[PDB]
Amino acid sequence: RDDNMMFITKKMIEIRNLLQKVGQGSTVTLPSIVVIGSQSSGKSSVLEAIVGHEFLPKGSNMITRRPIELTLVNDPEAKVDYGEFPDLGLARVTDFSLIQKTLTELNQSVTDDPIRLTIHSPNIPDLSLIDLPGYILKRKITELCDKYIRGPNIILAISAADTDLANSTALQASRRVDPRGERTIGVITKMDLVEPEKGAAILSDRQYPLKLGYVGVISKGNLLASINRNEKNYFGSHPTEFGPDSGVSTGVMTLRKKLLQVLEQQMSSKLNETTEAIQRELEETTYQFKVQYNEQPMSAESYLAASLDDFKHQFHEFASSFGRPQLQTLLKDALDQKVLDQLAARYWNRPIEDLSPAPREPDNIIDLPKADPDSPYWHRQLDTACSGLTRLGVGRLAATVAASAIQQHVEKLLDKSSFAKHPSARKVISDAAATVLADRSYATSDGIEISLKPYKFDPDIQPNEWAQGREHVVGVLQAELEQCQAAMKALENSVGGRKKLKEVMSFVDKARKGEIIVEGDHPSGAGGFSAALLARGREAVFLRDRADILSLRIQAAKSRQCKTLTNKYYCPEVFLDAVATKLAQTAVLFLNVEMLNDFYVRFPREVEAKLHEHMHAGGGLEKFAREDPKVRRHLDLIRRKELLETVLGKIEELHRISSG
């Protein structure tokens, strides 16, 4: 008739689960029933726990590496037998076969954390037992068991009637950690297959007595009531031995009632000291919240928003920094390299292989200053050079160059930004920039080609542009010369002595004249030189000839005859650089408007949308907060304080219920 006892035990198991949810070792907890049993005694254990409420998944092949915190609720007003998982909150399971597949899947998965469980049934009384592995690597299981039983939990030991009592590791360890036998109750299972003379012997024992006594039961829809009826009728077979007025106590209902009483008593006793300790740790947590974070509230979404605004301000400063002259230098450099490409491909020497060269005799690159001004060869050469340079993918070159530049700045800005950690969000940002630039790339390119269409027809060069082209050509050409000489010296140091590479140069020059010819029947050795030495000699001769042409053409570009633009066909370098600079600058105008400005406008919106879709689609906002240690400690402190507050509230409500 102790409905109020039922309610008070319910409130206390609730507050226990709350304390468990503030964390392990981060607070004091309330006791509960710990069950232990030997191999046979533990099969009878899991079977006992089954029949203690209703059929649930146990046994079979179990790792038992993780305990199972069963928290039961008295379930009036609900007419369906449903059990739910707290970690998978708000998810209910109707059939315990699904619970079978789930918790046995957690079994096969195997941290040492115990899985919590909650089951509601009107038949079952609210309780709080935890099932750890039964005794049978095996040293570790006994370590965890010992650790669990040493603390003042109400330990529930089971023992099969077949095994001797002094042989059961369940009762033996029960007596190991509890010599008085004051906080342990015993259950003798599989008791149907013994004589009731054994029943009185095992259940009523003076060899290893204990308070709370032993309780013998035979454990094995409507399975609860079925096992109940079996308990009621089995004892009619031998009523005088274990029946009314017999000292022993049996059946499942009595075991459950006793469990409720003992749990209520032990828990209620520890309740006062636990309560005082919780009040202390709430005081301390509040103190740390004041001193270290100045009581500043924090949420994951707040962190994400603030850091995103920081990144946006940083990007704004960058965009104010970037502008158009940077594009000017970038494009003008790329077109410098293109000018070099054209001049080499149309005027200068080629790569080197063993076959002797075609003569190219009628006109040569060095007679250019003193050649016929009306020369069809030179006219055609400079004209096809300019046509080739202009009718090149200058649009796609500008688009891809500006794209790589912007993306590089975005990744660097990210490196210095608040998104240094959280690599997932960082990748979302970078990929957003990449997709915006990719979207604008084609339109930028095609538009640049259209804007260049009039300079493709007549890129008329003004004298000032010509002088600019002269000054720039000198620097570009001389820089290329220095690169050639550096690669030459590197070739010398690579091959060995300068004299050796000079010898291989003599051989390659000999093969380049008529003085010697070689056939390709043996591609391993030609001359007194190896195949690799020969290849390196070819590259060395190429570098030599290109270097000589380069210095000669630098002197020619510095000549007085190149001062005026009227002999453009005599000075292709300066002319091509003038064309390159002009194309570069007008392409830079169109690029800056179209691609750059579209990036400055679309980039923040794309960041916002893709980040939202990531954080809300992946549930990755909470993990995003978890990634940074400082904010993780901050949110952990806030959650801890809130949890302790709600716990104290429940305790005060309970104390109100039992005081008035």
XYZ file of C-alpha atoms in Angstrom:
660
model
C 0.000 0.000 0.000
C 3.134 2.147 -0.233
C 2.289 4.133 -3.349
C 4.307 6.998 -1.850
C 7.267 4.596 -1.519
C 6.896 3.706 -5.201
C 6.894 7.413 -6.099
C 9.874 8.283 -3.884
C 11.951 5.444 -5.333
C 11.006 6.645 -8.832
C 12.138 10.194 -8.075
C 15.407 8.881 -6.632
C 16.257 6.682 -9.623
C 15.514 9.676 -11.861
C 17.943 11.851 -9.904
C 20.478 9.012 -10.046
C 20.299 8.872 -13.838
C 20.708 12.656 -13.919
C 23.856 12.485 -11.778
C 25.109 9.784 -14.140
C 24.456 12.148 -17.057
C 26.599 14.891 -15.532
C 29.483 12.450 -16.035
C 31.524 9.613 -14.582
C 33.784 10.612 -11.724
C 32.572 14.204 -12.141
C 30.021 13.921 -9.313
C 28.824 11.678 -6.537
C 26.104 9.179 -7.448
C 23.470 7.062 -5.695
C 23.757 3.290 -5.167
C 21.948 0.664 -7.226
C 21.700 -3.110 -7.626
C 24.748 -4.805 -9.152
C 24.226 -8.401 -10.291
C 26.974 -11.036 -10.548
C 26.989 -14.731 -11.424
C 29.280 -17.633 -12.409
C 28.947 -19.205 -15.885
C 25.984 -21.428 -15.007
C 24.957 -18.974 -12.273
C 25.223 -16.141 -14.826
C 23.133 -17.852 -17.462
C 20.642 -18.293 -14.635
C 21.405 -14.628 -13.884
C 20.481 -13.217 -17.295
C 17.477 -15.554 -17.366
C 16.469 -14.327 -13.900
C 16.705 -10.679 -14.965
C 14.599 -11.623 -18.000
C 11.778 -13.056 -15.896
C 12.057 -10.188 -13.393
C 9.923 -8.022 -15.691
C 9.341 -9.526 -19.174
C 11.259 -11.302 -21.936
C 14.150 -9.159 -23.197
C 17.297 -10.011 -25.196
C 19.968 -11.730 -23.107
C 22.386 -14.629 -23.338
C 23.053 -16.200 -26.753
C 26.698 -15.299 -27.575
C 27.502 -12.132 -25.617
C 30.744 -10.181 -25.290
C 29.367 -8.832 -21.967
C 32.312 -6.389 -22.137
C 30.026 -3.446 -21.306
C 27.584 -3.241 -18.368
C 23.893 -2.517 -18.899
C 22.261 0.108 -16.653
C 18.616 -0.993 -16.506
C 16.404 1.766 -15.100
C 12.774 0.733 -14.732
C 9.697 2.941 -14.412
C 6.358 2.169 -12.817
C 4.090 2.533 -15.830
C 0.486 3.435 -15.121
C -1.453 5.285 -17.832
C 0.615 3.530 -20.567
C -0.776 0.255 -21.926
C 2.043 -0.716 -24.330
C 5.218 -2.525 -23.291
C 7.903 -0.228 -24.706
C 11.588 0.197 -23.925
C 13.697 3.123 -25.091
C 17.380 4.047 -25.274
C 18.489 7.359 -23.723
C 21.371 7.957 -26.128
C 18.912 7.465 -28.996
C 16.537 9.780 -27.194
C 12.821 10.071 -28.008
C 13.074 6.761 -29.921
C 10.755 4.046 -28.602
C 10.834 0.318 -29.379
C 7.663 -1.765 -29.167
C 8.921 -5.299 -29.872
C 11.910 -6.542 -27.873
C 13.190 -8.375 -30.953
C 14.282 -4.980 -32.284
C 15.831 -4.407 -28.854
C 17.510 -7.785 -29.412
C 19.135 -6.776 -32.695
C 20.085 -3.339 -31.347
C 21.638 -4.154 -27.973
C 23.230 -7.334 -29.319
C 24.664 -5.182 -32.110
C 26.110 -2.958 -29.379
C 27.431 -6.206 -27.886
C 29.245 -7.253 -31.071
C 30.494 -3.650 -31.310
C 31.976 -3.495 -27.774
C 35.558 2.348 -23.807
C 34.040 0.268 -20.955
C 31.059 2.646 -20.913
C 27.800 1.008 -19.775
C 24.763 1.244 -22.043
C 21.786 2.814 -20.296
C 18.263 1.475 -20.754
C 14.720 2.428 -19.780
C 11.662 0.159 -19.949
C 8.052 1.028 -19.084
C 5.486 -1.622 -18.167
C 2.500 -1.471 -15.785
C 3.415 -4.939 -14.489
C 7.008 -4.051 -13.556
C 8.039 -2.115 -10.429
C 10.500 0.717 -10.934
C 14.037 -0.357 -10.106
C 17.677 0.320 -10.972
C 19.796 -2.762 -11.635
C 22.998 -2.923 -13.680
C 24.199 -6.151 -15.330
C 27.955 -6.555 -15.744
C 29.721 -9.626 -17.198
C 29.369 -12.839 -15.249
C 32.471 -14.685 -14.118
C 33.939 -17.349 -16.396
C 41.106 -11.387 -20.489
C 39.122 -13.142 -17.767
C 41.278 -11.224 -15.279
C 39.960 -7.939 -16.722
C 36.287 -8.902 -16.341
C 36.943 -9.728 -12.680
C 38.741 -6.381 -12.334
C 35.712 -4.418 -13.547
C 33.398 -6.587 -11.423
C 35.489 -6.086 -8.270
C 35.596 -2.339 -8.975
C 31.795 -2.227 -9.236
C 31.053 -4.332 -6.155
C 33.560 -2.709 -3.767
C 31.492 0.479 -3.528
C 28.356 0.389 -1.374
C 25.932 -0.788 -4.025
C 23.269 -3.324 -3.081
C 24.818 -6.400 -4.705
C 22.512 -9.111 -6.091
C 24.264 -12.486 -6.235
C 22.741 -15.478 -8.028
C 23.677 -19.147 -7.800
C 22.544 -22.245 -9.674
C 21.350 -25.071 -7.436
C 23.631 -27.561 -9.223
C 26.866 -25.870 -8.142
C 28.027 -26.047 -4.542
C 27.590 -22.807 -2.614
C 31.285 -22.529 -1.710
C 32.092 -23.060 -5.410
C 30.018 -20.158 -6.792
C 32.254 -17.189 -7.630
C 29.207 -14.909 -7.339
C 28.603 -15.623 -3.652
C 32.341 -16.039 -3.050
C 33.132 -12.533 -4.323
C 30.012 -11.227 -2.565
C 31.640 -12.416 0.661
C 35.035 -11.126 -0.517
C 33.908 -7.487 -0.673
C 31.106 -7.873 1.919
C 32.236 -9.907 4.939
C 29.221 -8.983 7.070
C 26.782 -9.939 4.314
C 24.825 -6.801 5.181
C 24.513 -5.249 1.706
C 24.160 -8.374 -0.465
C 21.115 -10.544 -1.156
C 21.294 -13.990 -2.721
C 19.125 -15.730 -5.298
C 19.213 -19.491 -5.875
C 18.149 -20.172 -9.465
C 17.422 -23.310 -11.496
C 15.843 -24.558 -8.288
C 13.179 -26.747 -9.882
C 15.655 -29.589 -10.530
C 16.490 -30.310 -6.880
C 14.717 -32.119 -4.083
C 12.884 -29.789 -1.674
C 15.200 -31.238 0.953
C 17.882 -29.482 -1.097
C 15.555 -26.483 -1.322
C 15.475 -26.084 2.451
C 19.222 -26.770 2.577
C 20.304 -24.204 -0.010
C 17.729 -21.463 0.581
C 17.914 -21.752 4.379
C 21.631 -21.926 5.126
C 23.609 -21.127 8.255
C 27.066 -21.758 6.762
C 27.170 -18.414 4.901
C 24.321 -16.379 6.411
C 23.488 -12.795 5.537
C 20.857 -10.181 6.222
C 18.160 -9.619 3.584
C 18.260 -13.408 3.172
C 18.331 -15.617 0.092
C 15.441 -15.959 -2.360
C 15.045 -19.106 -4.456
C 13.294 -18.882 -7.820
C 12.916 -21.047 -10.914
C 13.075 -18.705 -13.909
C 12.205 -19.686 -17.502
C 2.828 -13.521 -25.106
C 1.953 -13.077 -21.415
C 5.275 -14.628 -20.388
C 5.414 -12.623 -17.148
C 2.087 -14.003 -15.921
C 3.011 -17.454 -17.266
C 6.187 -17.660 -15.160
C 4.108 -16.285 -12.278
C 1.615 -19.165 -12.578
C 4.486 -21.661 -12.779
C 5.899 -20.218 -9.553
C 2.506 -20.502 -7.854
C 1.785 -24.085 -8.920
C 5.275 -25.578 -8.541
C 5.224 -25.046 -4.776
C 1.996 -26.999 -4.390
C 4.040 -30.039 -5.429
C 5.983 -29.667 -2.156
C 4.132 -27.099 -0.021
C 5.277 -28.155 3.447
C 8.964 -27.821 2.539
C 8.960 -24.263 1.090
C 5.513 -22.829 1.757
C 3.584 -20.738 4.276
C 5.261 -20.713 7.723
C 8.369 -22.326 6.217
C 11.289 -20.061 7.054
C 12.471 -19.790 3.437
C 11.195 -17.215 0.925
C 10.572 -17.890 -2.752
C 8.863 -16.766 -5.945
C 9.517 -13.858 -8.255
C 7.113 -11.328 -6.700
C 8.790 -11.626 -3.306
C 12.244 -11.200 -4.854
C 11.048 -8.052 -6.633
C 9.442 -6.626 -3.490
C 12.619 -7.236 -1.487
C 14.731 -5.593 -4.207
C 12.492 -2.517 -4.079
C 12.731 -2.279 -0.282
C 16.504 -2.737 0.015
C 17.233 -0.365 -2.867
C 14.943 2.274 -1.351
C 16.636 1.980 2.053
C 20.246 2.084 0.834
C 19.615 4.896 -1.662
C 17.658 6.966 0.847
C 20.536 6.596 3.322
C 23.201 7.773 0.869
C 20.828 10.540 -0.302
C 21.692 13.099 2.372
C 25.472 12.977 1.989
C 25.217 12.871 -1.800
C 22.940 15.925 -1.649
C 25.380 17.954 0.436
C 28.238 17.013 -1.906
C 26.193 18.032 -4.964
C 25.460 21.408 -3.388
C 29.208 21.855 -2.890
C 30.116 20.976 -6.477
C 27.400 23.300 -7.785
C 28.944 26.075 -5.689
C 32.371 25.336 -7.167
C 31.131 25.061 -10.760
C 29.373 28.413 -10.384
C 32.591 29.898 -8.987
C 34.672 28.696 -11.941
C 31.990 29.997 -14.296
C 32.369 33.426 -12.708
C 36.162 33.611 -12.513
C 37.206 32.033 -15.810
C 34.432 32.905 -18.290
C 32.895 35.932 -16.505
C 29.561 34.081 -16.733
C 29.419 34.705 -20.486
C 26.730 32.522 -22.101
C 27.833 30.395 -25.025
C 26.208 28.248 -27.698
C 27.518 26.359 -30.710
C 25.473 28.491 -33.097
C 26.757 31.634 -31.369
C 30.366 30.502 -31.823
C 29.810 29.617 -35.480
C 28.111 32.949 -36.188
C 30.779 35.027 -34.440
C 33.669 33.221 -36.119
C 31.946 33.497 -39.503
C 31.573 37.253 -39.021
C 35.263 37.430 -38.115
C 36.134 35.617 -41.342
C 33.833 37.923 -43.300
C 35.526 41.026 -41.878
C 38.942 39.573 -42.724
C 37.737 38.860 -46.264
C 36.401 42.420 -46.513
C 39.835 43.803 -45.639
C 41.354 41.527 -48.281
C 38.869 42.652 -50.939
C 39.643 46.282 -50.155
C 43.303 45.300 -50.549
C 43.151 43.385 -53.825
C 41.668 45.531 -56.546
C 42.943 45.711 -60.111
C 46.692 46.520 -60.349
C 47.444 43.139 -58.763
C 45.603 41.531 -61.661
C 47.645 43.836 -63.901
C 50.980 42.458 -62.690
C 49.733 38.853 -62.657
C 48.399 38.917 -66.213
C 51.326 40.945 -67.549
C 53.717 38.336 -66.142
C 51.807 35.411 -67.656
C 51.733 37.200 -71.026
C 55.465 37.823 -70.631
C 55.953 34.060 -70.463
C 53.690 33.728 -73.514
C 55.767 36.297 -75.432
C 58.848 34.231 -74.612
C 57.038 31.132 -75.890
C 56.144 32.772 -79.218
C 59.560 34.331 -79.827
C 61.281 31.001 -79.174
C 58.818 28.987 -81.277
C 59.060 31.333 -84.278
C 62.631 32.676 -84.212
C 65.107 30.748 -82.067
C 66.594 27.240 -81.840
C 64.756 24.007 -81.020
C 65.303 20.961 -78.769
C 68.100 18.582 -79.717
C 68.212 14.951 -80.869
C 70.897 12.933 -82.643
C 69.724 13.518 -86.230
C 71.681 16.337 -87.865
C 69.795 19.626 -88.297
C 67.942 20.942 -91.281
C 69.979 23.902 -92.570
C 67.559 26.837 -92.090
C 70.337 28.500 -94.172
C 68.657 31.216 -96.283
C 67.932 33.460 -93.279
C 69.315 33.356 -89.734
C 68.387 35.060 -86.477
C 71.603 37.079 -86.165
C 71.531 38.858 -89.546
C 68.238 40.558 -88.601
C 69.625 44.100 -87.972
C 71.278 44.117 -91.419
C 68.602 42.516 -93.589
C 66.296 43.702 -96.353
C 63.539 45.888 -94.845
C 61.106 44.480 -97.430
C 61.853 40.859 -96.595
C 58.843 38.559 -97.101
C 60.283 35.998 -94.683
C 60.755 38.397 -91.777
C 57.461 40.158 -92.498
C 55.633 36.822 -92.449
C 57.524 35.766 -89.320
C 56.658 38.751 -87.133
C 53.122 38.833 -88.548
C 52.428 35.176 -87.750
C 54.030 35.742 -84.345
C 51.623 38.566 -83.492
C 48.654 36.688 -84.964
C 49.627 33.646 -82.909
C 49.988 35.629 -79.685
C 46.668 37.445 -80.041
C 44.686 34.460 -81.329
C 45.748 32.476 -78.269
C 43.482 31.563 -75.388
C 44.302 34.837 -73.630
C 40.797 34.829 -72.176
C 41.176 31.388 -70.615
C 44.685 32.310 -69.475
C 43.429 35.401 -67.659
C 40.511 33.461 -66.155
C 42.626 30.589 -64.839
C 45.431 32.863 -63.622
C 43.034 35.153 -61.751
C 41.218 32.073 -60.447
C 44.386 30.517 -59.027
C 45.360 33.885 -57.541
C 42.009 34.503 -55.832
C 41.814 30.920 -54.576
C 45.370 31.196 -53.239
C 44.475 34.375 -51.342
C 41.346 32.682 -49.991
C 43.308 29.703 -48.689
C 45.964 31.941 -47.126
C 43.291 34.134 -45.526
C 41.748 30.929 -44.199
C 45.145 29.910 -42.785
C 45.345 33.132 -40.772
C 41.592 33.088 -40.076
C 39.470 31.718 -37.235
C 38.878 28.561 -39.297
C 42.438 27.263 -38.884
C 40.963 24.398 -36.866
C 37.686 22.723 -37.916
C 39.111 21.357 -41.201
C 35.640 20.311 -42.395
C 34.197 23.832 -42.306
C 37.425 25.166 -43.815
C 37.029 22.754 -46.722
C 33.430 23.911 -47.149
C 34.615 27.522 -47.447
C 37.440 26.739 -49.867
C 35.153 24.613 -52.034
C 32.582 27.431 -52.065
C 35.167 29.900 -53.374
C 36.248 27.315 -55.952
C 32.698 26.787 -57.207
C 32.019 30.523 -57.536
C 35.221 31.100 -59.505
C 34.425 28.073 -61.675
C 30.942 29.452 -62.371
C 32.332 32.763 -63.595
C 35.394 31.377 -65.404
C 33.837 30.794 -68.828
C 31.823 34.020 -69.011
C 34.926 35.962 -67.979
C 37.042 34.244 -70.642
C 34.583 34.637 -73.527
C 33.912 38.254 -72.597
C 37.646 38.929 -72.575
C 37.994 37.449 -76.063
C 35.128 39.629 -77.325
C 36.681 42.745 -75.784
C 39.986 41.802 -77.436
C 38.376 41.305 -80.862
C 39.364 44.810 -82.117
C 42.989 44.444 -81.006
C 43.140 41.071 -82.750
C 42.475 42.922 -86.017
C 44.785 45.939 -85.564
C 46.691 46.211 -82.276
C 48.115 49.565 -83.333
C 51.057 50.533 -81.128
C 51.654 54.106 -80.062
C 55.227 55.388 -79.574
C 54.842 55.654 -75.783
C 53.602 52.056 -75.619
C 56.619 51.185 -77.775
C 59.047 52.771 -75.304
C 57.317 50.964 -72.435
C 57.668 47.722 -74.383
C 61.375 48.400 -74.863
C 62.035 48.978 -71.159
C 60.049 45.878 -70.222
C 61.582 43.660 -72.927
C 65.084 44.403 -71.662
C 64.231 43.153 -68.170
C 62.224 40.120 -69.312
C 64.822 38.963 -71.834
C 67.724 39.460 -69.425
C 65.859 37.551 -66.710
C 65.384 34.671 -69.153
C 69.106 34.836 -69.936
C 69.976 34.586 -66.242
C 67.646 31.595 -65.876
C 69.394 29.947 -68.834
C 72.858 30.499 -67.359
C 71.729 29.184 -63.971
C 70.329 26.040 -65.597
C 73.627 25.705 -67.491
C 75.749 25.905 -64.345
C 73.397 23.400 -62.707
C 73.934 21.119 -65.705
C 77.716 21.424 -65.281
C 77.627 20.648 -61.552
C 75.240 17.770 -62.298
C 77.338 16.102 -65.009
C 80.625 16.663 -63.188
C 83.463 18.800 -64.459
C 82.823 21.667 -66.834
C 85.426 20.062 -69.112
C 83.445 16.806 -69.346
C 80.257 18.587 -70.411
C 82.420 20.566 -72.847
C 83.608 17.260 -74.342
C 80.051 15.956 -74.688
C 79.266 19.353 -76.240
C 82.039 18.764 -78.764
C 80.485 15.390 -79.605
C 76.957 16.787 -79.981
C 78.293 19.637 -82.120
C 80.165 17.106 -84.269
C 76.955 15.131 -84.784
C 75.233 18.442 -85.544
C 77.686 19.104 -88.362
C 78.473 16.562 -91.047
C 81.697 15.531 -89.320
C 80.197 12.358 -87.817
C 76.996 10.353 -88.261
C 75.614 7.578 -86.059
C 72.890 4.998 -86.656
C 70.401 3.689 -84.116
C 71.080 -0.049 -84.019
C 72.374 0.194 -80.419
C 70.639 2.881 -78.313
C 72.764 2.129 -75.219
C 76.114 3.564 -76.308
C 76.927 6.073 -79.044
C 80.403 7.490 -79.355
C 82.504 7.075 -76.245
C 79.594 8.507 -74.276
C 76.675 6.854 -72.509
C 73.034 7.430 -73.442
C 72.330 9.564 -70.365
C 75.526 11.589 -70.773
C 74.526 12.120 -74.408
C 71.023 13.333 -73.506
C 72.435 15.724 -70.907
C 74.880 16.959 -73.536
C 72.022 17.648 -75.954
C 70.191 19.712 -73.344
C 73.453 21.510 -72.563
C 74.054 22.463 -76.208
C 70.454 23.667 -76.489
C 70.934 25.841 -73.398
C 74.156 27.224 -74.886
C 72.635 28.198 -78.240
C 69.519 29.689 -76.633
C 71.749 31.655 -74.247
C 73.798 33.089 -77.115
C 70.687 34.040 -79.094
C 69.269 35.627 -75.942
C 72.278 37.876 -75.286
C 72.501 38.865 -78.959
C 68.806 39.758 -79.013
C 69.182 41.752 -75.788
C 71.923 43.817 -77.427
C 69.729 44.215 -80.519
C 66.777 45.364 -78.405
C 69.086 47.875 -76.697
C 70.366 49.100 -80.087
C 69.509 52.568 -81.401
C 67.708 51.023 -84.399
C 64.987 49.711 -82.042
C 64.402 53.155 -80.489
C 61.732 54.015 -83.063
C 58.670 51.866 -83.698
C 58.781 52.202 -87.495
C 61.134 49.205 -87.816
C 58.778 46.902 -85.946
C 59.741 43.945 -88.144
C 63.369 44.505 -87.082
C 62.525 44.487 -83.344
C 59.930 41.755 -82.692
C 60.624 41.605 -78.944
C 59.539 45.150 -78.052
C 56.541 44.965 -80.410
C 55.282 41.697 -78.920
C 55.726 43.060 -75.395
C 53.709 46.145 -76.329
C 50.904 43.932 -77.640
C 51.140 41.786 -74.506
C 50.918 44.795 -72.185
C 47.902 46.239 -74.018
C 45.979 42.950 -74.172
C 46.883 42.412 -70.522
C 45.541 45.772 -69.396
C 42.194 45.720 -71.204
C 41.689 42.080 -70.243
C 42.511 43.225 -66.706
C 39.703 45.787 -66.827
C 37.093 43.264 -67.955
C 38.440 40.643 -65.533
C 38.344 42.993 -62.547
C 34.744 43.954 -63.208
C 33.260 40.580 -64.172
C 35.095 37.859 -62.284
C 36.553 39.752 -59.353
C 33.453 41.773 -58.513
C 31.212 38.751 -58.984
C 33.483 36.932 -56.541
C 33.264 39.712 -53.958
C 29.479 39.622 -54.148
C 28.708 35.905 -54.567
C 31.392 34.505 -52.248
C 29.808 35.492 -48.880
C 26.379 34.241 -49.952
C 27.818 30.908 -51.109
C 29.737 30.598 -47.831
C 26.554 31.236 -45.849
C 24.423 28.779 -47.823
C 26.960 25.948 -47.943
C 27.894 26.330 -44.283
C 24.213 26.277 -43.293
C 23.602 23.158 -45.374
C 26.669 21.517 -43.821
C 25.953 22.322 -40.160
C 22.244 21.507 -40.335
C 22.414 18.680 -42.880
C 25.244 16.816 -41.168
C 24.340 17.589 -37.569
C 27.968 18.811 -37.528
C 27.292 22.017 -35.594
C 27.742 20.269 -32.243
C 30.903 18.562 -33.517
C 32.098 21.926 -34.853
C 31.843 23.251 -31.304
C 33.534 20.099 -29.962
C 36.541 20.622 -32.264
C 37.969 23.712 -30.555
C 39.212 22.827 -27.041
C 38.541 26.179 -25.348
C 34.926 26.467 -26.464
C 34.459 22.774 -25.654
C 35.520 23.450 -22.064
C 33.212 26.476 -22.025
C 30.135 24.561 -23.171
C 31.014 21.659 -20.871
C 31.067 24.035 -17.900
C 27.712 25.555 -18.855
C 26.107 22.140 -19.366
C 27.516 20.932 -16.046
C 26.123 23.899 -14.133
C 22.690 23.505 -15.748
C 22.641 19.770 -14.983
C 23.543 20.328 -11.330
C 20.828 22.991 -11.087
C 18.131 20.644 -12.390
C 19.378 17.895 -10.054
C 19.131 20.130 -6.976
C 15.674 21.149 -8.170
C 14.569 17.517 -8.301
C 16.047 16.876 -4.847
C 14.245 19.894 -3.363
C 11.024 18.686 -4.972
C 11.568 15.221 -3.447
C 12.324 16.671 -0.014
C 9.133 18.726 -0.358
C 7.233 15.527 -1.164
C 8.540 13.850 2.003
C 8.258 16.880 4.320
C 4.975 18.554 3.315
